[PDB]
């Protein structure tokens, strides 16, 4: 006999499958979407079941028909000689994929086929065979495409990816058949060291070890689809089985190289170790619990080999960027001369390695697009532009900030126009704020470089992207304690560039009645309050920012009747108000119905009504090119002394946005 077979595989693997079938004897192989049709004699059927590492399932087409009625399928199914095919007492199951105008539901199709099969027994007065979906002895597949159903015996039984070293469920993050592909694409030469420092369940390393010691994927499988079937040939199966034993033993006894796996998670490593032991190859592989950060080359004196792995992906994250960036640095340092292959769902994260891949492959892993890329690591740059600038600013501002008593400040303010980003330090945290795949990888480089210059821990870096759950952070500004939130708002709750105007209010405050309009989180009120203000009044339209202001006042012991918070539109509040204040801070947005340039004079007109004799208004804004109407003011009997230069902090000295600042008083 010449038999006709079909092997299914994952899309993308078909050509690799066909070569593997050919290498083991198969003839007339033709790739097709999701599989390979092939031929060989009966030893060849058994040899492909035992030996194929890429096949998901191997089956035997039994026939095919057109399906234009429940009847056609029924007739079509009964053409095949079931009663003679089943061993006595064999259980069965039917899996049916695909649909047409008559079989509009798959489970329906599986049902009609199952019924047609049972009816081959009824019509010959035989005991009806039972179904066992869990572990049938006979599995029948049918594939319906366009108008044709194709029926086939599944010879694999369980999927061929189960090699007998795991759990039949299971759910591996990478199927065994895909992991064997990855090893084949990796450039890894069997017989040279292989290492995976993020090894998970160890699957990559176990497939590799089995491939390299000629250990058949089938060697340890406990069950096959051919055992319930009458045409089965035990003596040929026995001969394939004994050929497998012989080759495994020699493969193992002769292998002289080694496999190294490591992973940070102690649970997976215990599973990796039991898996490998059950694969038969456990003596060839060493697993340890170890972070990529302490990765070392166990063979510093050679021979070179391959580092093969499947890193975590963004399931933008600073921790991932840092993990990829450090891996590249460790490759270069520890594994010069070696081959590197990586399977990832994030090409952008692979770019953080700072290596150029000389080969790549696309593969689906379930629903996810992944790539595998291979690289050569040279024997014995990185936005050095930004790096040097940032190391400079760091030396400069760290010292300046220590002298001034400042712990939140701007480390970098788009100083180089090709690295157009702000980096703000808040105590032990850092926020990088973007302004600007090409783009994304440049951003990643900036993040890697900034994590590396600062010596900061990745989880303490927050990325605010060009494109709200959690936590507030307590910070100081000279003597104020303030709450910030680095992630949930467009801003952090503290406008850092205005710290000096804030410190000044605090010096001008002793026994003063203070008013703060457009107060935001009330940081200026906290400075006034701690300067001995006799009462503070803090106003803003936002209930959230007023709650946050109150929490800031509370943080510095400023509670009770003397410290008020008022939710209002500040302009209508100004129209109607009567009380008087000695010190007034008003620092509005440029627009909100309100226009600072247009309306400032009319604010000063109302503010005048509220300013107690001898009092001062500190007015500020950040409208670009703002013009103070000095004539309007003098007409109101007010004068204005610009203090903009005196209130400029060093960390913001080169910034475009100018925060203009004025002391207004009685003429
Ligand atoms: N910093 C670090 N050092 C070492 N291992 C890490 C790490 N960060 C994450 N990991 C590990 O990286 C792994 C990525 S998932 C690996 C899946 C694996 N190839 C398989 O076939 O089963 C996880 O096991 C996680 O524990
Ligand atoms: N018409 C209006 N009346 C009252 N508050 C307003 C407003 N329009 C905007 N605001 C508030 O103005 C603030 C702008 S942020 C101003 C910065 C703030 N003065 C500080 O010292 O930190 C926000 O808190 C916003 O809610």
Curated annotation (Swiss-Prot):
It catalyses: guanosine(2445) in 23S rRNA + S-adenosyl-L-methionine = N(2)-methylguanosine(2445) in 23S rRNA + S-adenosyl-L-homocysteine + H(+); guanosine(2069) in 23S rRNA + S-adenosyl-L-methionine = N(2)-methylguanosine(2069) in 23S rRNA + S-adenosyl-L-homocysteine + H(+). Changing residue 388 to A: Impairs m2G2445 formation, but does not affect m7G2069 formation. Keywords: Cytoplasm, Methyltransferase, RNA-binding, rRNA processing, S-adenosyl-L-methionine, Transferase. One of its GO terms (molecular function) is 23S rRNA (guanine(2445)-N(2))-methyltransferase activity. It comes from the Bacteria. Residues 44-155 form the THUMP domain. The N-terminal RlmL activity is enhanced by the C-terminal RlmK activity. GO terms for cellular component: cytoplasm. GO terms for biological process: rRNA base methylation; rRNA methylation. Changing residue 310 to A: Impairs m2G2445 formation, but does not affect m7G2069 formation. It is found in: Cytoplasm. Its EC number is 2.1.1.173, 2.1.1.264. Residues 389-667 are annotated as: RlmK. Consists of a N-terminal RlmL domain and a C-terminal RlmK domain, linked by a highly flexible loop. Monomer. Belongs to the methyltransferase superfamily. RlmKL family. Specifically methylates the guanine in position 2445 (m2G2445) and the guanine in position 2069 (m7G2069) of 23S rRNA. Methylation occurs before assembly of 23S rRNA into 50S subunits. This is Ribosomal RNA large subunit methyltransferase K/L.
């Amino acid at each position: 006999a010449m038999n006709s077979l079909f092997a299914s595989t994952a899309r993308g693997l078909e050509e690799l499958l066909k070569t593997e079938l050919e290498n083991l004897g198969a003839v007339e192989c033709q790739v097709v979407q999701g599989g390979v049709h092939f031929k060989g004699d009966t030893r060849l059927v058994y040899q492909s079941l035992m030996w194929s590492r890429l096949a998901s399932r191997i089956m035997l087409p039994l026939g095919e028909c057109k399906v234009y009625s429940d009847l056609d399928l029924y007739l079509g199914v009964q053409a095949i000689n079931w009663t003679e095919m089943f061993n006595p007492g064999a259980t069965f199951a039917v899996h049916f994929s695909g649909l047409n105008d008559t079989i509009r539901n798959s489970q329906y199709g599986a049902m009609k086929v199952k019924d047609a099969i049972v009816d081959a027994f009824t019509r010959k007065n035989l005991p009806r065979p039972n179904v066992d979906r869990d572990a049938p002895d006979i599995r029948v597949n049918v594939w319906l495409h366009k108008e044709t159903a194709s029926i086939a015996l599944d010879l694999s039984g369980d999927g061929l990816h189960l090699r007998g070293y795991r759990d039949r469920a299971g759910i591996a993050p990478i199927k065994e058949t895909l992991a064997a592909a990855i090893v084949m694409r990796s450039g890894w030469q069997p017989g040279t060291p292989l290492l995976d420092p993020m090894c998970g369940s160890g699957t990559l390393l176990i497939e590799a070890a089995m491939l390299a010691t000629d250990r058949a994927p089938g060697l340890h499988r406990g069950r096959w689809g051919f055992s319930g079937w009458a045409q089965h040939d035990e003596a040929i199966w026995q001969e394939v089985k004994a050929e497998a034993q012989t080759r495994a033993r020699k493969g193992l006894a002769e292998y002289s190289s080694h496999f190294y796996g490591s992973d940070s998670d102690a649970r997976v490593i215990q599973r990796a170790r039991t898996n490998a032991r059950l694969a038969g190859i456990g003596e060839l592989i060493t697993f340890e619990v170890k972070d990529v950060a302490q990765l070392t080359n166990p063979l510093p004196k050679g021979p070179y080999g391959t580092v093969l792995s499947n890193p975590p992906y963004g399931e933008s994250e600073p921790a991932l960027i840092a993990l990829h960036s450090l891996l590249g640095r460790i490759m270069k340092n520890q594994f010069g001369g070696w081959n590197l292959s990586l399977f990832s769902a994030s090409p952008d994260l692979l770019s953080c390695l700072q290596l150029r891949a000389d080969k790549q492959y696309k593969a689906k892993n379930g629903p996810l697009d992944c790539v595998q890329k291979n690289y050569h690591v040279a024997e014995s740059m990185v936005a050095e532009d930004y790096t040097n600038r940032l190391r400079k600013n760091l030396k400069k501002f760290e010292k300046w900030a220590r002298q001034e008593g400042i712990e939140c400040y701007r480390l970098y303010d788009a100083d180089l126009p090709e690295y157009n980003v702000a980096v703000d330090r808040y105590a032990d945290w850092v926020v990088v704020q973007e302004y600007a795949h090409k783009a994304r990888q440049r951003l990643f480089d900036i993040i890697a470089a900034t994590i590396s210059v600062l010596g900061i821990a990745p989880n303490k870096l927050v990325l605010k992207t060009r494109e709200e759950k959690g936590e507030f952070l307590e910070v100081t500004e000279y003597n104020a304690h303030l709450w910030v939130n680095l992630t949930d708002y467009l801003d952090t709750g503290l406008f850092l560039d205005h710290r000096i105007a804030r410190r000044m209010l605090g010096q001008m405050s002793k026994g003063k009645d203070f008013l703060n309009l457009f107060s935001y989180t009330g940081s200026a009120t906290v400075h006034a309050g701690l300067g001995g203000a006799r009462s503070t009044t803090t106003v803003d339209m936002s209930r959230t920012y007023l709650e946050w202001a109150e929490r800031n006042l509370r943080l510095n012991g400023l509670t009770g009747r003397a410290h008020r918070l008022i939710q209002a539109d500040c302009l209508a509040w100004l129209r109607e108000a009567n009380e008087q204040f000695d010190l007034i801070f008003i620092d509005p947005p440029t627009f909100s119905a309100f226009d600072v340039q247009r309306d400032h004079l009319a604010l000063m007109k109302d503010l005048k009504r509220l300013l107690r004799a001898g009092g001062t208004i500190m007015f500020s804004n950040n409208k670009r090119g703002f013009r103070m109407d000095l004539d309007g003011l003098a007409k109101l009997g007010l004068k204005a002394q610009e203090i903009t230069q005196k209130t400029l902090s060093q960390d913001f000295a080169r910034n475009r946005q100018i925060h203009n600042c004025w002391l207004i008083t009685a003429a």
